[PDB]
Amino acid sequence: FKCVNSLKEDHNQPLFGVQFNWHSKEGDPLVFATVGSNRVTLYECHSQGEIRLLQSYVDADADENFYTCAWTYDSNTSHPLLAVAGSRGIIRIINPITMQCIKHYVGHGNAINELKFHPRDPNLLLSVSKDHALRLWNIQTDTLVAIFGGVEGHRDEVLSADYDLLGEKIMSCGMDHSLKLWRINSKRMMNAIKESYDYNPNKTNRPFISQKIHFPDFSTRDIHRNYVDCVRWLGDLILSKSCENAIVCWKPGKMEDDIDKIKPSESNVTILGRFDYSQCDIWYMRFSMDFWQKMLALGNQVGKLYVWDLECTTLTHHKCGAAIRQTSFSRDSSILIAVCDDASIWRWDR
Length: 350
Ligand SMILES: CS(=O)(=O)c1ccc(-c2cnc(NCc3cccc4c3CCO4)n3cnnc23)cc1
Ligand SMILES: [Mg+2]
Ligand SMILES: [Mg+2]
Ligand SMILES: [Mg+2]
What we know:
By secondary structure, the chain is mostly beta strands. It has one helix spanning 187-198; strands at residues 2-8, 15-20, 30-36, 39-45, 51-58, 66-73, 80-86, 91-95, 100-105, 112-117, 124-129, 134-138, 143-148, 158-163, 169-174, 179-183, 211-213, 218-220, 230-234, 237-241, 246-252, 269-276, 287-289, 295-299, 305-309, 313-315, 324-329, 335-340, 344-349. WD repeats lie at residues 10-53, 61-104, 107-147, 153-194, 223-260, 278-311, 319-350.
């Protein structure tokens, strides 16, 4: 990788999120979104390292602090859509063509730390919050499908979550040092999703009733000893990190235990490997994988970018010295974008 370009957003506030739109065809514009301050900005990647500013969304609330964004598409037209959220605990769905807010969802008792769209169902949006819960939304019918949390749910702020490859299950993590598994392919969750598609408030005076999932399908506090701020699936395996200068690769149960045979009382975990690095011991630092899950990237607190081949390399620039909060690879993995605490954006080309 070579650093081909960089820019600084005029708001001068930290950028906490960056996502390339992976829902565009080959030959279509390479677009990425950044989120920082109360702003959402779209950029287009062109040849010879050129970055073109497309549009900017500025939230009506000046006190909003966007922490996360995630792309989807409208199933009927294939038109892209962008979901954003942060400190206000409000999810906003933005039309990226006009950069206008189409709709909003309220419900979480606090800030939203991460948003993820179901890998198969583009209408299924997952949010994780400081209120200790995860929420699954159906954005086609504007319904709250399920709330994951309660007694045996997270006991502190949820920082991250990820769906597995097929979207049959979710792994979540947070400030309680725990990683929790929630199956959404159960008869209960499959019926709840089916019911959310039939719901329409114009044909009934009764509200749609959300599933209250109080119990995870697996839980562990034996991987990390501090806030777990990033979790991703790698097939049936899990990649997770805390502020202990390591990304841990692990699985629930014993070495040969099938993840779909695991009982909720499973007390074993198996560590399969570790990706070690330096100076990334502050909270709220996200790692990312390319579409192919062949590369793993993580920025550190002094602007160094670590890249590992999943099938190490350190990317540095003398002008890049602020914490890299999040990175995103373009769908073809030819471009890696890093966003920083000083509102700076860095473009690395393969
Ligand atoms: C020192 S400072 O500049 O004043 C500052 C201020 C706020 C935050 C902050 C960032 N991000 C989130 N949530 C999203 C999140 C969650 C897990 C990992 C992760 C992210 C974003 C990048 O990596 N926050 C929730 N509460 N505060 C925060 C960090 C530093
Ligand atoms: Mg084996
Ligand atoms: Mg299976
Ligand atoms: Mg063990």
